[PDB]
Amino acid sequence: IEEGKLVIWINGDKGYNGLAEVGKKFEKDTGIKVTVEHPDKLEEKFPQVAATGDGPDIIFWAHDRFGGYAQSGLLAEITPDKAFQDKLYPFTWDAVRYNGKLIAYPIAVEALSLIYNKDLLPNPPKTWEEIPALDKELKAKGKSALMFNLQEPYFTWPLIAADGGYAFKYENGKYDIKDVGVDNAGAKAGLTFLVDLIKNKHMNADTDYSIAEAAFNKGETAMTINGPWAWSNIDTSKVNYGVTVLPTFKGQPSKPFVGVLSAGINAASPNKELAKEFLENYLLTDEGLEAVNKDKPLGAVALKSYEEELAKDPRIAATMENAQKGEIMPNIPQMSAFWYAVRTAVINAASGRQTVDEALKDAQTNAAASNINKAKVASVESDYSSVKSAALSYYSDKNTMPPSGELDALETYMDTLPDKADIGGGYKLLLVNNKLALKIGDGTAADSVTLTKAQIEKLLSDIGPKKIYTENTLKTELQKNSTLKDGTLYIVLIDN
Numbered sequence: 194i195e196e197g198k199l200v201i202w203i204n205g206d207k208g209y210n211g212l213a214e215v216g217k218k219f220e221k222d223t224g225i226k227v228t229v230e231h232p233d234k235l236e237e238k239f240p241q242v243a244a245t246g247d248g249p250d251i252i253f254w255a256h257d258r259f260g261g262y263a264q265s266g267l268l269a270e271i272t273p274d275k276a277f278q279d280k281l282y283p284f285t286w287d288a289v290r291y292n293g294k295l296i297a298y299p300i301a302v303e304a305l306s307l308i309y310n311k312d313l314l315p316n317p318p319k320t321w322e323e324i325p326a327l328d329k330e331l332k333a334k335g336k337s338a339l340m341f342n343l344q345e346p347y348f349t350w351p352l353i354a355a356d357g358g359y360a361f362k363y364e365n366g367k368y369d370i371k372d373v374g375v376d377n378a379g380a381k382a383g384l385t386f387l388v389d390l391i392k393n394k395h396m397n398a399d400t401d402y403s404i405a406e407a408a409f410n411k412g413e414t415a416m417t418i419n420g421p422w423a424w425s426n427i428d429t430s431k432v433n434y435g436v437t438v439l440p441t442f443k444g445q446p447s448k449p450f451v452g453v454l455s456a457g458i459n460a461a462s463p464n465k466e467l468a469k470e471f472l473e474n475y476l477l478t479d480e481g482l483e484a485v486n487k488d489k490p491l492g493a494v495a496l497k498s499y500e501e502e503l504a505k506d507p508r509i510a511a512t513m514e515n516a517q518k519g520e521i522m523p524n525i526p527q528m529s530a531f532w533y534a535v536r537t538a539v540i541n542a543a544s545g546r547q548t549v550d551e552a553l554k555d556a557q558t559n560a561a562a563s564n565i566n567k568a569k570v571a572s573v574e575s576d577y578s579s580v581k582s583a584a585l586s587y588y589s590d591k592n593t594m595p596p597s598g599e600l601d602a603l604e605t606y607m608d609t610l611p612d613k614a615d616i617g618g619g620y621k622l623l624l625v626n627n628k629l630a631l632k633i634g635d636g637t638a639a640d641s642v643t644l645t646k647a648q649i650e651k652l653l654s655d656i657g658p659k660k661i662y663t664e665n666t667l668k669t670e671l672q673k674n675s676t677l678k679d680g681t682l683y684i685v686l687i688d689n
């Protein structure tokens with residue numbers, strides 16, 4: 194990185210030339226140079242070079258990766274003023290909130306749609322099941338029915354989820370990282386259908402993003418599956434295209450994962466204030482978003498005033514319809530493991546390196562926590578982090594620590610207030626000397642924590658040294674072979 198200039202990373206399928214135009218307008222006004230790059234494997238390179246203390250000032254990606262980035266301390270907390278926050282749709286803010294803290298600026302909502310060539314297929318299929326028969330007719334003309342990227346699980350997920358597959362189960366405001374649905378009957382039905390399409394030579398296992406795009410834009414295939422960013426290149430081509438709802442599978446809608454394109458600020462950037470100025474006052478304005486959108490369509494933008502302006506576009510209506518039937522992606526750190534797991538399953542099943550049953554069995558193992566005890570610890574870490582953030586807001590506003598007692602003191606600073614720890618025990622607040630601590634458990638058989646040594650290690654590693662105590666004056670720290678005889682934990686949320 195370099196002070197006095199901004200470097201921005203964004204994926205190559207997005208409108209980086211339009212973003213560069215916003216950067217030039219920024220440079221005009223402020224003299225600060227903005228350089229937009231689009232590295233390969235962007236989402237993997239960032240966490241290596243950021244952990245280093247380098248990388249871009251600003252990173253763009255869908256929101257699902259950002260929880261991992263935040264957990265690793267790679268991201269600067271973002272603090273938009275209330276009036277700025279009011280300019281963006283609340284559900285897009287929700288996508289970039291991680292344990293009570295905003296960790297990026299939301300930009301736009303994307304979901305996959307069915308894109309079809311109206312000159313080859315005046316009426317698109319309503320069902321996946323009728324696609325083999327379409328392909329047979331089209332083969333007669335030297336064409337094919339459908340081509341889309343089979344190397345990225347994002348594109349095959351809508352079909353996998355249709356009959357019941359899911360990533361992480363959501364319950365009581367939290368994701369369960371043990372409860373993964375990649376291996377149920379629904380996921381198997383979806384992936385089996387895909388593999389049958391390939392076995393019957395309706396599709397090719399080697400088809401990647403570039404191959405599918407070239408084929409559709411040259412008029413060689415009647416349909417593809419892609420997001421709003423792709424519409425630009427279809428515009429430039431001679432194809433008369435429509436954008437519509439994904440086909441149903443076994444009578445149920447396809448369920449694409451919904452992504453919110455987001456911009457995060459590198460925690461090691463010496464340019465955070467410049468980065469904040471650029472994002473809030475240049476990019477996230479009608480003119481800034483128009484420049485990006487004119488280059489490669491964003492989808493349904495997060496900025497209310499501009500979303501209204503574009504809302505009549507039938508292609509955006511179709512995007513929103515598919516997004517409605519799908520699910521918002523979790524942003525939790527375990528998403529990276531989920532995506533690696535499903536990529537491997539889809540590639541191996543498609544190429545014949547694993548049967549469908551074997552591929553998904555392995556995928557469930559790869560995607561889910563190793564065991565329920567680890568999932569319990571992740572849950573308690575989530576609770577702790579959320580309560581901490583809430584207690585910090587309480588302090589800054591009252592210039593007092595919360596009262597020792599119920600967690601309800603922090604109620605209006607959270608929405609989902611934690612009631613009970615998954616490791617056992619209830620939550621209370623416990624003010625001691627200069628510290629506010631989260632008390633877990635109350636020393637009774639019915640209300641107390643149990644921790645294995647494995648769990649104790651994980652907590653210590655994940656939460657850090659001198660934070661977890663086993664007695665109410667915060668003398669004795671939790672340690673590997675602690676008996677936890679009294680079944681109570683004290684975790685410091687704030688110290689002065």
Ligand SMILES: OC[C@H]1O[C@H](O[C@H]2[C@H](O)[C@@H](O)[C@@H](O)O[C@@H]2CO)[C@H](O)[C@@H](O)[C@@H]1O
Nearest residue numbers: 204206255257258345346347348452532
């Ligand atoms: O395929 C796994 C991949 O899916 C998503 O990535 C999308 C991205 O959200 C879209 O904006 C577009 O760039 O296509 C990508 C897939 O090639 C997840 O966001 C990503 O984390 C995940 O690895």
